[PDB]
Structures are given as C-alpha cells and as structure tokens.
Fold:
Amino acid sequence: HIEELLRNIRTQVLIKLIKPYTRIHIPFISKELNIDVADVESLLVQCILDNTIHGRIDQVNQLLELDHQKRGGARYTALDKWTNQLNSLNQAVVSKLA
Amino acid sequence: NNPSELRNLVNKHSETFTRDNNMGLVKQCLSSLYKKNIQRLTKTFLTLSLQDMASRVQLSGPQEAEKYVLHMIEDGEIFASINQKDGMVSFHDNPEKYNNPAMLHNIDQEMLKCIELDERLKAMDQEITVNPQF
Amino acid sequence: YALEIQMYTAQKNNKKLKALYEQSLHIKSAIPHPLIMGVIRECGGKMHLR
Amino acid sequence: VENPSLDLEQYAASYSGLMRIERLQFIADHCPTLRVEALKMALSFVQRTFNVDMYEEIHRKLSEATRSSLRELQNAPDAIPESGVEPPALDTAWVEATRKKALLKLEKLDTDLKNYKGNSIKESIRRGHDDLGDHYLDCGDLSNALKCYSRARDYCTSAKHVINMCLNVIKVSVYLQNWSHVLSYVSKAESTPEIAEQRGERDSQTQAILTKLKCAAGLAELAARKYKQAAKCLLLASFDHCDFPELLSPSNVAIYGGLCALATFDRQELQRNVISSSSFKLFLELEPQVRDIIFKFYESKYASCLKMLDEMKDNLLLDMYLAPHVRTLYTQIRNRALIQYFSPYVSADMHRMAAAFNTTVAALEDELTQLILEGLISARVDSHSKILYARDVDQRSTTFEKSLLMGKEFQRRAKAMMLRAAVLRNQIHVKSP
Structure:
C-alpha cells in the first residue's frame, strides 16, 4: 500500500495548496511535492475528472487555470429554464385556436 | 450539406421550377448552403486556413474563401477577420457582452411592443365577453 | 474455520478467504470473548483493505 | 478479416447441445482460417446428441470448402487414402437412423406421459412434459419444446417448480430468438421464491438461482441495445452459477459486462459498479485483457487502451451475440474518450492528443469538428500552430440572446393568430366556387 499512502499525502497537500492561487505552475507544484513534472501532470488529470481539484490545464504554457471564475450563474440558469417553458407555452396556447 | 449534389438536383428538377416560376429563388438556396457551410466552421474553429476552408466547403480556390467571408462582413452575417500574412481566417464572434446600456434600451423597446400587443388582445377578449356565449 | 484460514492465507487464494470469512460471521453472535475471534478477523481485515 | 487468435478449443468446450453447433457455424462463416477445424468440431459434436439437420448443412459447407480450387483443401492431402484425419462424407444410413431413433424416442416419452395423466399426480405430469420438452431440443425441433413447457405450467405447486420451468422455457426461447419472453419469465422466477429470498437461504444457497436469471436478462438487454442496463443487470451475476453450457459461458459475461459498461458509463458509475464490486472481480481476474482495458481507459491511458482494444476487436466480432455491437460500442468509447480528454484541459496540444487516440493530427481535427457541432465540447482549434483552446461559455450570452429571440417569435405567432382569428370570425375560407 505504501506507494498509495505517498500519493494520498501528496494529493491532500495539493488541495490545501491550490486555494491562494488561480494560476499555479506545474513545475512549481512538482518541486513542492518532490517528484517530476510528468507524475504531477498525470495526477492532475485524474483529479479534475474525480473533481478533488477544480480547474483545467494550459499545457502550452504549463499552468493550471484553476476555477474561481465563478460569479453567480444561479440567476442566469433559472432565467434560461423559465425562458425555454415560455416558448413551449406560447406554441401550445396559440395552437388551440381552431 | 453537400452543394455538389444540390446542384445536380436543380438540373434534374428544372422544368418544374420553370413552369411554377420560382426560378431564381431556387438559385439562392444554393448560395445559402455555401453560407451555412462557411458559418458552421466558425462555431468549431478559432483559426482555420483559407486553403483548408476551400477544400472542405468545396469553394475550390482560397481566393474565393476570402471573397465569400468579405461579402458576409458587409452583410453582418459573420464576425471575422482575415490574416493575409499567415493565410488564415481568424473568427471573432462578440457583438454583445450583454452588459451594454444599448442592450437595455433594446430590451426596453421590445417591452413597449408587448404591452401594446396585449392591449389588442384585451379589446378583442372583451368583445367576445359582450357577445353571448354558446 | 481458523485453521482453514491459516492454510488459505499460506496458499494464497483471495477468493476462498472472503467466503470463509462471511460464513464465519453467522456463528459469532453467541460466542463470548475468545482469542479465535481476533484470529478470524485478522484475515478479514486484510481482504477488506484489498 | 482474419485473426486466428480466438482460441477455438475453449469456445467449443465451454458449450454444449444446440448452442455449440450454432455458434461454431457463426465463427466459420466470418473467419477464413478457423472454418475447417470448426466444421470438424461441429461434426464430432453433431454425431452425438442426435440431430440430422445440422449434419447435412455443415457437411455441405465442408463439401464446398474441400472441392473448390478457390480454397486450398483440395490439394491439401494430394490424394485421399484412409488416414484418420480424412474429410468424411455423408453416410446414408446415419441420417435416416438418427431421425428414426428420435421419432421412436418421442413415442416412448409420450406413452409415459399418458399413464402420468391417467394417474393424475401433478408432479409426474410436469416431469413428463419436461421429458418430452428436452427430447425435442436434442432432435433439433425448436418449436415443439416450448409447447411442452407451456403445458407444464398448470401443474405447479412450489416456487421451485416455477423456477425450473421458466429456466427451461428460457432455454427454448433463445432458439425461437425473441428476448422479451426471457424478461417476463426471469422476472416471474425472481418474484416467486420470496423476491429471491430474505435470508440468503440461511448461510448460503447451494446453487444460485439469482445469478442465472440476471445473466439471461443481461444477454437480452445487450442485444436489445439497452447497453447501460445490460452491464447493470449482468455485473451482479457471480461465479456462483459456475458455468452455463446452454445460455452463456463465463468468459463472455466478463467481456460483455466490461465493454458494455465502458461505452455508456460516466466516472462515478464506473468506480461504483465495475471496480468496487467483489462480484465482478472473479470475472475481471479470469481474463486480464478486459480488466486492463477498463483501468487504462479510466487513468487517461487511452494510447495503451486503444492499442489492446484493436487487437481484440476481430476476435470479439467472431462471437455470435456480440458481433453487430462491436462497432457501436467502440465508437461510443472513442467519442466519450474525446470529451474525457478535453474535461481537464482548457488548452491542449493537438499532437499529444492525436498520439493518445493513435490517429494522425489531420484525422483527429475532423473528429473534433464533429464533436464541437453535434457534441457538447465547447472548444476551438487554432489550426495555425495546432493548439486546442479554450472557449469559455457564458451563461449570460446564451440566456440573453435566447430571451430576445424567443420574444420576437412569441410576438410573431400572436400576430399570426390575430390574422387566423380574423378570417374565421368573418367566415371565409378557400372555396373552388
């Protein structure tokens, strides 16, 4: 298991670390974890898909475009659901005539 | 979504087009497919070459690819820019950010229309209210 | 069940150890406090980690 | 196509009765090299069990395979002496005899069924209907076996007796080739013994009825192309049943539950159902190829995964039930894999992407275009310097534009309605006079 335990520590440490940034570099985190860039890159990919790290990668500049790009959203999606029912409703009502 | 076939069909179907006399319109539907074929590429690509556009759209001349978007720029069916150094087209696509006061005024104008449309309906619903129901 | 688990851990077949363990759980309720309960548990814990 | 690295021996041995002859003939049809050996394995099996039809038909394909100059089997022994391996020929006596004995056998069984009806003991009548039913399946007569079992049904007096019959009926129903009947009867069987017990039948059950029924349902659904549901029912099937030589060998459940899950399943479901499960684990262990494929897909190991995947492809295509689905599932694994790649990458370099999917940049470009339009991947290609970027969607731009557009069409329909109401109210419509 010991290999897994090593990965486990490094993975928790990564989630703590990530939070002050919104742009963090892969050679900077590899250096901090104490391993090479490629195993960190592979960890990140699996982490975004599991969603224990939030963001996406820029591999043509070696950055993490972490997500803190949130704003609201909740208003904007509720207006979309409202907006789609009004189309179906107008189509329905006008079609009842004769 | 293939112009070569649409073209062949128009000659097959030709006599109908002439007797019914919606000739010339049938021609527009062919140009509109080429516009659709160019415009779908925009959705997909940031940057694409003219040579590449030309083979796939079946324009068969990069010179015409540049000519076709340029017609559309004047029309305002496309938001794009041409890079003749690289031999690329760059797509933009950003007419509105939706936080303009221009957009506020546009939405405000659309509300005045709705309130009048409703008022036509009220007079007409009321009219049936006067008439006795069956 | 314990002697059987002691043989099956040395022989090393993961499958049989798992069935032996579930089958041993049914008996457990009317047992008091013995040594045997830890020995049987010990194999079960390892199979759970896997 | 060809791929002779489908172990023919294992595929025969794992089956029995009608299912074996049927399957073997499918593989002989699709693969060139494997056909000869398949026809002989089929003929050795056909000599037993007692069926006439398969013997004529299979021997007919063997008589083509030798005699022609197209094939290489004519100059293969370069003279026909006796040997021990020597292509056989029809035996005029065997074909009459098999039919004669089969018919005679059916008569013995009918006479027996007649006294059991006379005695009026229900269980003896039910056993008889089983005996007539099973004989019709050895002789080769698919239909009559179902009729016998249908009759068996109103002689039941125990949850077990219902269970035996439904399974028996399922055996027949595969041969008729309608899957929907398997589902009614499996559900019926599952519901009848206390909703598959309530205690585990105490400590355990001697032979898992539970495992047989899920695996039959899973085969039915795979075929239906209910693929997500097909993995879901089948994974729960365990090695309890041990083997099934009249519906589905244990090798094929591992393949079916793996490949059928991978196409259609998302990440949460993959971990919860295929990986964490004790049940599926015997199956994953049984062949490491299916197992390595799952992890490699999950780890973002697409380059190793697809490489193992193409190699297996043609073998899985020789399998009777599995074959039309290979293309449909493989496409689904690639298009899901394409999304799955772009999820962590805002900006990806296309050469790495192309290499991972084992296709060239150019090919990969045209696959992506398709996904941007038809699919959900909001991304743009900078084909100048080959970088995949990095489209941020805006929840605002899509709602506002929609609200404005939706407002135009709402008004237009209202105007359209006033005009409809206007001709109706003053009573004009089109008339020829």
Notes: Residues 2 and 35 of chain C are 11 Å apart (CA to CA). DSSP finds three helices and no strands in chain C. The interface with chain D takes residues 15, 18, 23, 26 of chain C (CB under 8 Å).
